[PDB]
Scaffold this active site. Structure first.
Site, short mmCIF file in Angstrom:
data_model
loop_
_atom_site.label_atom_id
_atom_site.label_comp_id
_atom_site.label_asym_id
_atom_site.label_seq_id
_atom_site.Cartn_x
_atom_site.Cartn_y
_atom_site.Cartn_z
N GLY A 1 44.11 43.01 -70.75
CA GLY A 1 44.12 44.40 -71.11
C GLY A 1 42.98 45.15 -70.44
O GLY A 1 42.78 45.07 -69.23
N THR A 2 42.23 45.91 -71.25
CA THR A 2 41.19 46.78 -70.74
C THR A 2 39.97 46.04 -70.17
O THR A 2 39.13 46.67 -69.52
CB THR A 2 40.72 47.78 -71.82
N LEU A 3 39.88 44.72 -70.37
CA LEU A 3 38.79 43.93 -69.80
C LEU A 3 39.03 43.47 -68.35
O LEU A 3 38.08 42.99 -67.72
CB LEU A 3 38.50 42.71 -70.68
N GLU B 1 36.28 43.17 -79.96
CA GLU B 1 37.70 43.18 -80.33
C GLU B 1 37.95 43.21 -81.87
O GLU B 1 39.07 43.02 -82.36
CB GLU B 1 38.44 41.99 -79.70
#
Ligand SMILES: O=C1CC[C@@H](C(=O)O)N1
EC number: 4.3.2.8
Length: 149
Positions: free
Chosen positions: A8-10, A82
Site C-alpha cells: 500500500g502506501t509504504l 498501522e
C-alpha cells in the site's frame, strides 16, 4: 528482525514510503519485488482512500508488493503506524519472489514467508469494491490517499 510485505502506501513511490527510511524508527532494507501466492481482496475504502488487504485469502486477486527486511525497532514502529491490532492486524503469508530475469541446479527458491498488515473486520460491502492487483495512490481510479482530517 523480520520480513514485511508492503502493498500500500509504504511501497516505493507511495505517500508513506518515507517512514521506512527514517532511522529514528529503526531499519528497513529492500529485499525483493513480490506477489502474493494466494489471492486477497485489496480495496480502497473510507474517507482517506486508504488501501486495505482484506483477510479473505482465496478471493480477490494476487497482490503485488515489496519485501523489506526490518529490525525489531522498525516492526514496533510499523505496528503502531498501522494502528494494530484494532485497525490492521499483523498476519503472515507466503509471497512469490519476482526476479528481473526468468531463471541452475539446484534452482533458486522462489517463495518467502512475510508479515503483512491485513484487516479482518470491515463493513461487508467493502469486499465488493474494486479489487486491485497493484495499489497506487495516483492510479487510474483517481482516489488519491489523503490523510487530512
Ligand atoms: O497503506 C498501507 C496498507 C498497509 C501498509 C502497506 O503499504 O503495506 N500501508
Amino acid at each position: 528482525m523480520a520480513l514485511v510485505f508492503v502493498y500500500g502506501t509504504l511501497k516505493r513511490g507511495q505517500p508513506n514510503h518515507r517512514v521506512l527510511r527514517d532511522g529514528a524508527h529503526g531499519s528497513a532494507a529492500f529485499r525483493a519485488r513480490g506477489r502474493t501466492l494466494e489471492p486477497y481482496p485489496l480495496v480502497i475504502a473510507g474517507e482517506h482512500n486508504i488501501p486495505w488487504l482484506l483477510h479473505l485469502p482465496g478471493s480477490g486477486r494476487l497482490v503485488e508488493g515489496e519485501v523489506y527486511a526490518v529490525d525489531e525497532r522498525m516492526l514496533r514502529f510499523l505496528d503502531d503506524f498501522e494502528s494494530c491490532p484494532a485497525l490492521y492486524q499483523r498476519t503472515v503469508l507466503r509471497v512469490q519472489l519476482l526476479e528481473d530475469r526468468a531463471p541452475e541446479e539446484p534452482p533458486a527458491p522462489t517463495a518467502v514467508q512475510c508479515f503483512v498488515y491485513s484487516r479482518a473486520t470491515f463493513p461487508p460491502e467493502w469486499a465488493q469494491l474494486p479489487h486491485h492487483d497493484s495499489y497506487d495512490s495516483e492510479g487510474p481510479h483517481g482516489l488519491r490517499y489523503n490523510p487530512r482530517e
